[PDB]
Amino acid sequence: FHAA
Amino acid sequence: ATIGRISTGSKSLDKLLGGGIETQAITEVFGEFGSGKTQLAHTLAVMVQLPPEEGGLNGSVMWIDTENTFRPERIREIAQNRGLDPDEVLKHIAYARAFNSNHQMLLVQQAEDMIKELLNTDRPVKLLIVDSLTSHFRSEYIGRGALAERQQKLAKHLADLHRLANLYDIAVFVTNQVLAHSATLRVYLRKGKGGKRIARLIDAPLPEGEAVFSITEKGIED
Numbered sequence: 659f660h661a662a
Numbered sequence: 663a664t665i666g667r668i669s670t671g672s673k674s675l676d677k678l679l680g681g682g683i684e685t686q687a688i689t690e691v692f693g694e695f696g697s698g699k700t701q702l703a704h705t706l707a708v709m710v711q712l713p714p715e716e717g718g719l720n721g722s723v724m725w726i727d728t729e730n731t732f733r734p735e736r737i738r739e740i741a742q743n744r745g746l747d748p749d750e751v752l753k754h755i756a757y758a759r760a761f762n763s764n765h766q767m768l769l770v771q772q773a774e775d776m777i778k779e780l781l782n783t784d785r786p787v788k789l790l791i792v793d794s795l796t797s798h799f800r801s802e803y804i805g806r807g808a809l810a811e812r813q814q815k816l817a818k819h820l821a822d823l824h825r826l827a828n829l830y831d832i833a834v835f836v837t838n839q840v841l842a843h844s845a846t847l848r849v850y851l852r853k854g855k856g857g858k859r860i861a862r863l864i865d866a867p868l869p870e871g872e873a874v875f876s877i878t879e880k881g882i883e884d
Contacts, residue, residue, distance in 0.1 A: 659724060659756040659757060659758045659769075659772060659773065659776060660756065660757060660758070661752065661753050661754075661755070661756060661757070662725070662732070662734055662737065662752040662753075662755035662756070662757045
């Protein structure tokens with residue numbers, strides 16, 4: 659997961 | 663924890679849902695291509711970040727994307743048209759692409775790490791999106807029985823999602839393109855006349871009736  | 667509710671942006675759809683989608687629940691939207699499932703996901707990813715007086719939960723989002731349908735541009739559009747800073751809204755969506763069904767399943771465990779991290783912060787995770795829940799499973803596995811791999815794996819996946827919803831007070835929102843009674847709530851979505859979208863609850867003997875809404879620059883609206 660990574661910030662959008 | 664009390665159940666929290668995230669407004670969809672449509673008063674009609676919210677009434678159908680009893681105020682919005684619930685935390686400690688899986689809400690499954692299903693319908694044909696073009697019925698607005700992914701639009702509703704994008705809208706919710708913004709709405710949940712609003713304060714409660716505006717229909718949100720001041721929450722963070724996690725998004726598992728199995729079809730490459732997440733669009734940061736669309737988030738930015740909806741955010742600015744709902745009075746939020748697009749930079750902040752994007753910052754509070756944690757995004758991952760799921761490669762295949764097995765990776766999709768592992769990503770739920772990965773998600774729990776960040777749910778725990780944020781749990782006692784000012785912006786806990788309040789929305790977990792899986793769009794599409796079923797596309798990889800249907801593509802990879804052919805058999806229909808309870809003993810077949812497709813059902814075994816999807817049952818575990820759904821149980822994992824349930825567990826997160828209820829343990830950490832999260833609304834889980836999943837899409838399915840047309841087992842079936844696993845979701846806390848099933849919503850059938852279809853595209854009707856003049857670009858209107860129509861929603862009906864399936865097997866929820868909640869309000870009878872149908873909600874109608876439009877897809878707009880604010881995400882969805884009446």
